[PDB]
């Protein structure tokens, strides 16, 4: 969705990426150059450098203000007009929904996973946006690993290696006899 | 203007926006001391007139008639003013032989009064929509006013008194299936004469018709009489109330009618070296001037400069006699004979002085361009004086520098 | 108060006139004839230096306010119609020209799609805008444009003009008038845009879905022996007087098909409505589908509205759109003014509302103070 | 060339009388009805026919070579006759130009090889560009430029035409001398 919204803002800068192939280079532009400002309103008033990005053909494009106000839509999806909570909100709401005793320990242990946390100054913004929503004088540690993109797989690789995994999985003969539920019931 | 290439040697304007324009196009501002361009100055609207039947129409009548002449018509096929021909009248063009009979408009008994353009097909639906939105906009105004005076009051919506005819337009019905392209278009020769081009289609925008027989002749477009007003200065120039069949200005003001105009009388060789003779005529009756300055070093936008013009000459006092003079009537001593200046000054006729500039061509490949500054004693007369009652010595003392850019043929 | 002027700066043509009128007073090609230049430069050009764009717009607005319209710019307000996602620097420049140079009282930057909706009177409707550069669609639901569910493809005038030029150069048959009665190919390296536009309008038309679907497979030649319908007769078009270009019948009904061609991606002018409508909220589906609006001069092409509405109902049955948009009744609105001048007419209807105009519109006193035009991007 | 008017040396053969210079090469069939009050120039191979005319020309009028000034015939139901044309003061007709115009205004610059139509009125301080066709019974306002095969409003002239055009025609006359 951030890649889709960046394409719209790039057309508002005057660079069209209409083709499905041309959507892939918008994802590359996003991954290369898009920084999350701590205050979005101050960076908008400030005149941008307009940092040049080089395309596959060789042509240059000056991204400018589209760079920072594209990934902002994660933290504030109402701006474009998508009815959602937001990345700062879903984290806090998930902790607040859980029992009162655990809230402090769950705030004290937050782990960032996936590729859409690697945005430059994501941890800086999230910490600030969580703090104001979360209760006052509570310790908030957002422990990002160095391998966020490949964290999900490494977990499976460790889980798979354990002898307990031998019990957890569903055998081919089990699926034929037990039925369809076999996969669902053994999931957890 | 065009015969002699006025679009060669240009004068510079001072302010926010710097522009290089011919002196013929520029205007001198008398309120202050700074010549300004047609671009820099603000434009106004004085009078409307028809280019065929020259009739000065008022501003109010134009708004009703949609900036058009009732009597005159322009042909739709080609863009030219039509003419009434009799047999009992039909409208015909001179350039193309398009008639009013071709499209099938009936001949009128009366000459001008009979002819008319059909009413717009969606004019009734228009007024109904305006009145609906007008009533609906009025509700928003009252809501916005009530909200604003409540904020201004700052009473926190305190209920002192009790709070709280309709116009309903029917929305357009959506057709289930739009009319298909007629089966004629398949297997039929297309004559390009019968169908109309885009240009002549778009001149009639209210119902732009594909066929020529539908395309009616539109009324002739009224033209404008421009009046210029500056940012700092108030008035500048304007036109009479009878601009139709008149070449008179109510207030004549132009850069050529105050600042001394420079012209390249002779053009020498363009092969790396030469000596060019340029004239410096005065327009004012009695004044003084000097082309001393060499446009400094990398100041006053000398980027166009592709040569080193010396013009190492002191001031020369020239005067204009507004009268039909004979060939060498009288020889003045102090003006002409005393500054002989045979190397510098080429010739000195009435309101004329030729000057030799030592240019250095072929510094670039080609297109030789020279920057030089010209000074003149501007009798501004800014202070109140009736037929030069005041001395105007401080005014005459004022030296106005115009950064000229002469461009040699090359 | 005075009747506020309406301007609508487009790549091909600009609409101009006064508020509370049946249609626009002047409609002309958006170009300027500068001294030295043989072909006149286009006034709206995206991705250039601001100073060069400022001079072109200053030159153009001057021609509109004096030669075409006859009225003082400072006296009365402006209603600038411009499409949604119009480049930032261009809109910033256009306002800066009107506010600084001309010193207009107040400009109102209306989106073309929301203005097109007012002309009908209906509060909610889907709006397709087949223009010169890009054919854009934007669902408008009860006054609120839904930017979330936008859609655009480069299948407008420019893409059609380029396709015509390519086809004519392949099957090039001109009678120069110099022993050129015999078919002479590519005597001129390029054809000027003014000619191509006139050929498109007069000669070329939009085919029926049944005939068009055969034309697509015919030129493909997908394991079939001459499976094309019978074309129309060849039309002879004059080029620069003496040179007579014989336009092939195939070119007339094949040039248009690039708009309605699937091209594997499943991205046509037809698909763009259904692609947008499927992405819209579940409650809004049935209201938007029932109220379709087709503006833009590209849709004026003869038999475009029938082909589109037909191509829609065919693409509905396709398995992708069959689930969501299966049992939906697609009905087109017929606007009061012509397809080209629907956008303009909205701004005039809006301009007639003096009370709301002054409030919504950005005053010069605000712009001189701030120097920040409000946009749908963050403030 | 760069504002300054250039030298043009005339031959011995030319009819110089009371300031008015008329090339002997240029026939003017009908010398009775045609009249040249001022210091006019008519270049070689030019035509000024007396087909029931009254061709009055300006103070400093100029007509370049291979150019024709013929009066138009008025298609009147009462009587069909040739309408007498009146060339204004300080009029500059360019080379190879065709003129079938009735009442040409003062201080005008008619371009090269440009055909002006039948019964065509031109008001003072106008300019017709080169390779242009003004159709029959057309009017051109002051401070205007008409061009194209249609012959329609192209733009406006410089404000200072009245003062400027005087210099042009008088300079050309003064500069145009015998060899
Ligand atoms: N270095 C990066 N900076 C910013 N965004 C990135 C970066 N790397 C990946 N992304 C974004 O994250 C996505 C990768 O998501 P991923 O972590 O693979 O998801 P999943 O956990 O479902 O496998 C990319 O498509 C891109 O949009
Ligand atoms: N009346 C018409 N009939 C057929 N085609 C037209 C007509 N008017 C315009 N067109 C074509 O459609 C295009 C419409 O573009 P337009 O909507 O005026 O520009 P923009 O999208 O920049 O506002 C033109 O470029 C032209 O090729
Ligand atoms: Zn001034
Ligand atoms: Zn008239
Ligand atoms: Zn005509």
Numbering used by the authors:
A (entry chain I): 189 to 376
B (entry chain Y): 2 to 88, 106 to 182, 219 to 464
C (entry chain J): 12 to 390
D (entry chain V): 1 to 179
What do the paper's sentences say?
Dynactin is a 1.1 MDa complex that activates the molecular motor dynein for ultra‐processive transport along microtubules. The pointed end is important for binding dynein‐dynactin cargo adaptors (Zhang et al, 2011; Yeh et al, 2012; Urnavicius et al, 2015; Gama et al, 2017; Qiu et al, 2018; Urnavicius et al, 2018).
In our previous structure of dynactin alone (Urnavicius et al, 2015), 10% of the particles showed the p150 arm folded back and docked onto the filament (cartoon). The region that contacted the pointed end was assigned as two coiled coils from the N terminus of p150 called CC1A and CC1B (Urnavicius et al, 2015; Saito et al, 2020). Although this only resulted in a modest improvement in resolution, our new map enabled us to better distinguish the coiled coils and interaction interface. We fit our dynactin structure into the map to examine the residues on the pointed end contacted by the p150. This shows that CC1A/B in p150 interacts with distinct set of residues, which overlap with the sites used by cargo adaptors. CC1A interacts with site 3 and site 4, whereas CC1B covers site 2. This suggests that the p150 arm acts to autoinhibit dynactin and that this must be overcome to allow cargo adaptor binding.
